[PDB]
Structure formats: C-alpha cells, structure tokens
Design a binder for this molecule. Structure first.
Ligand code: SAM
Ligand code: KOM
Ligand code: MG
Length: 212
C-alpha cells in the first residue's frame, strides 16, 4: 500500500462519483488532515481556476499528473470539446491519475501520456494531432521547466498568446526558468503570489504568455 493509492482509496470512499468538485475536496482534506502530498493544492488551485476561466483554452498540456488532482481541477472547467493532455513518467502515478479522472467523470476530457515529457513533447503533433497549445501547466521536476519550455518552442507547440503557467516558482524554486521567462522579450510575465500546499510558506505561480 502506497501513499498515492491511499489517496485514491480515500476519494473512492469519500467523494461523490462523477462530481469533480467533491473529488478535489476529498484530496484536499486527506492531504491537509493526514498526509502531505505534492498536489498543487486549493489556494493555488483557486488561482488556476481563475486563469483557466479567463482564457478558456481548447487545448491544455499538463506536465506532471501525480494522483490527478490538478488535472481534475482544470478539466472540470473546460468547455465542451476542449481537451487536456497530461504527461506523467511514473506509471504507478499515471495509473492512479486514470482511476481518479475516471471517478470524477472527466476521462473523456483527459488523455494521459505515460512517459517523460522530454521524450513525449516531440511526439505531440504526430501522435496526438496537436497544432499549438493554448495553455501549458508546468508542475513536474523543477529542473525540467526551462528545457521543456525551450523544447515546446522548438517543436512549434507555442502560439502567440499561449499561456504557460508554472507552479513552485518560489518553492522549491525554478530560478533558471523564471530568469529566462522574465528576461526574454518573447514571454510576458505576471506573478501570482500564494502559499505552498497544506503549509503557509510563500510560493507562487508564474504566468508566462508567449509573444512569438
Ligand atoms: C508535483 S507532482 C504533480 C502534481 C500535479 N500537477 C497536481 O497538482 O496534482 C510531479 C509529477 O511529475 C512527474 N514528473 C517528474 N518529471 C517528469 C517528466 N520529465 N515528465 C513527465 N512527468 C514527470 C513525477 O512523476 C510526479 O508525479
Ligand atoms: O519535484 C517536486 C518536488 C517537491 C518537493 C521538494 C522537496 C520536499 C517535498 C516536495 C514539490 C513540492 C510541491 C509541489 O507543488 C511540486 O510540484 C513539487 O515538485
Ligand atoms: Mg507544484
């Protein structure tokens, strides 16, 4: 028995099936009252809701799924026919995320790509019929934010107005990505201050909007 499948079980025992909001709240209390996990969490969760409502993206790419919390968070707010793609390298995690999405009712909105983003991003246009992404959520290993951003730009996945939204920009930190995105005239940035999940340490999301 694994921390993640401990969470999956809590959800299946406590959330109302087919109800995304309920699933989220089961995850948040489980992680607030018993075991800490690295889900984006509710406080930054609300920021993400707001940004997605604003842009209403047709096509979203998530880097790093884990137990499915942020994928459920985002897919619940997508319009009919909009699509989330989520990359997860750990198959135990990609298996839980599927079960979590399934429970929430969101499996028709969300495609799990099992693998490592560096390998999967170049396969995106060919194997998944992607022209450009409207939004990208970055929440995988922190040393991967910049290289995957440069890789998305390289494979032609970014479009004038594509929104990159980055978790953990302060804690644990992604200094090279922040420096690159703020300094670059090809990305318009706004910082949205908040607090780490389940603990009030100051983290934040960076939104970085691709300029071409
Ligand atoms: C911080 S957790 C993601 C949490 C999720 N975004 C949420 O809010 O619920 C990070 C995940 O990224 C996965 N990961 C790390 N590096 C990756 C990579 N290069 N490609 C795909 N997945 C990766 C890890 O296996 C881990 O499950
Ligand atoms: O790779 C990590 C590693 C951590 C992490 C680093 C040190 C201790 C615990 C978690 C992490 C935390 C919160 C979070 O939202 C993340 O996306 C994280 O990603
Ligand atoms: Mg995070």
């Amino acid at each position: 028995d694994t921390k993640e499948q401990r969470i999956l079980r809590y959800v299946q025992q406590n959330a109302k099936p087919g109800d995304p909001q309920s699933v989220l709240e089961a995850i948040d209390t489980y992680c607030t009252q018993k075991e800490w996990a690295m889900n984006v969490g509710d406080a930054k969760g609300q920021i993400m809701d707001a940004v997605i409502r604003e842009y209403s993206p047709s096509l979203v790419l998530e880097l790093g799924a884990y137990c499915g919390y942020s994928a459920v968070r985002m897919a619940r707010l997508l319009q009919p026919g909009a699509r989330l793609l989520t990359m997860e390298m750990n198959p135990d995690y990609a298996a839980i995320t599927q079960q979590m999405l399934n429970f929430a009712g969101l499996q028709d909105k969300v495609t799990i790509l099992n693998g490592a983003s560096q390998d999967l991003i170049p396969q995106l246009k060919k194997k998944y019929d992607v022209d450009t992404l409207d939004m990208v959520f970055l929440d995988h290993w922190k040393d991967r934010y910049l290289p995957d951003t440069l890789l998305l730009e390289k494979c032609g996945l970014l479009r004038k107005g594509t929104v990159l939204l980055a978790d953990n920009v302060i804690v644990p930190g992604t200094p090279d990505f922040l420096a690159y995105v703020r300094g670059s005239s090809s990305f318009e940035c706004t910082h949205y201050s908040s607090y780490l999940e389940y603990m009030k340490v100051v983290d934040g999301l960076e939104k970085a909007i691709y300029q071409g």
